[PDB]
Chain length 161, copies 3
């Protein structure tokens, strides 16, 4: 009996402003589990109108902020609408520098926390994922948030008789 | 000809105390490759009695300590009993902050080394994996050790004639 | 309908010298997608002679250097010849400490940027991947560059009638 599953990494362009990290700009592309779209601060109604199988957005006001955080930290609350027809789980998140116009941005160390919640493949449920990252100081900067997605719909092949 | 394999990320709750990192508490849950159980400092006999397909524990006294380490470093020796019936390999380890009771813990930068050993799916062999991490200072703290597991039992599908 | 893909992590032994990171020594082994070989500064002709399905090398003079980098940064330009017959994409890169002869090396924090380019499974095309990492200071050191590879040849199984 053998097992296999699906994994997918997505680069989310972000901006850090003091305590808040947000998605900058808007991205729309296709992938094995369908069309993906991302854009900051969308409503639980707008997300539903977006023409895509997976829409990632955020809570404009990520109010939620862990106790013990300092000026070097920053938060974000991801909003996910999954209509891919596959259960999704985030297995990893990393904030990395970016290179734009031959210029390095987000040239800083980083570590990140993120809640583990199954991202149900429903059509009316918006799943929220809290993300809290630590950086070198409190300066603003642009960077990329790499989100590793894994599917829970595991393939199991057996050799029966 | 196409190939596919299985990957799985597990969050191990840990505690850092000077030079030693240990698993705090005990976790037991089910996953595609079976029931998983984890608990600090178990004997090579106790692990064998544990009712689970994959038991992760540690060497209470992780004696082994790389030369060149300072007060900011910490070690751990993972003990793994794999009865999942699948060859396993750790492809990644990261120490991240945790959020407990709305409180951030392990709010520190981190980098980790870990040995690459195939984790044989035997029933009497306990595989050991050395882990050495670097942190900002020598202060104690709680955090999460994210271990990425990959299977070596790769699925290969060909279209023969 | 379920989906599954293939992922593979490779440890590349590296050396950091000021602004340049290079592969130290030479590695040759077999893996699900074929034999892999790696060695620093190979020509676009030598790589082609190497007896392997996947050859990773570098641009001896990684000239390309992002603006905004300091003494703590370092660059590398990976050269990849993919003859595995599978489209490859790098989903992750991390620089970690190494342990040699019971000695920790590269005991430093780190963050890395890397371009996202599909690595076509052609036979005459050498794909280049820019990598820029940030470290604690400008000191030289040895370490390991963990490159996570994912395949684009996704397996899709449906239950038709």
């Amino acid at each position: 009996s053998v097992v296999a599953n699906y994994d997918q990494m997505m680069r989310v362009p972000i901006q850090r402003r003091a305590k808040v990290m947000s998605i900058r700009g808007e991205r729309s592309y296709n992938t094995p589990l369908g069309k993906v779209a991302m854009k900051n601060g969308l409503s639980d109604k707008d997300m539903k109108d977006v023409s895509a199988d997976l829409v990632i957005s955020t809570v404009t006001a990520p109010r939620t902020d862990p106790a013990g955080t300092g000026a070097e930290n920053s938060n974000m609350t991801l909003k996910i609408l999954n209509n891919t027809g596959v259960d999704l789980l985030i297995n990893d998140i990393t904030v990395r520098p970016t290179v734009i116009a031959g210029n390095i941005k987000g040239n800083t160390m980083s570590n990140t926390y993120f809640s583990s919640k199954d991202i149900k493949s429903s059509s009316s449920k918006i799943t929220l994922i809290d993300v809290c990252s630590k950086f070198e100081d409190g300066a603003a900067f642009e960077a990329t948030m790499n989100i590793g997605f894994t599917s829970k719909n595991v393939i199991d092949i057996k050799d029966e008789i």
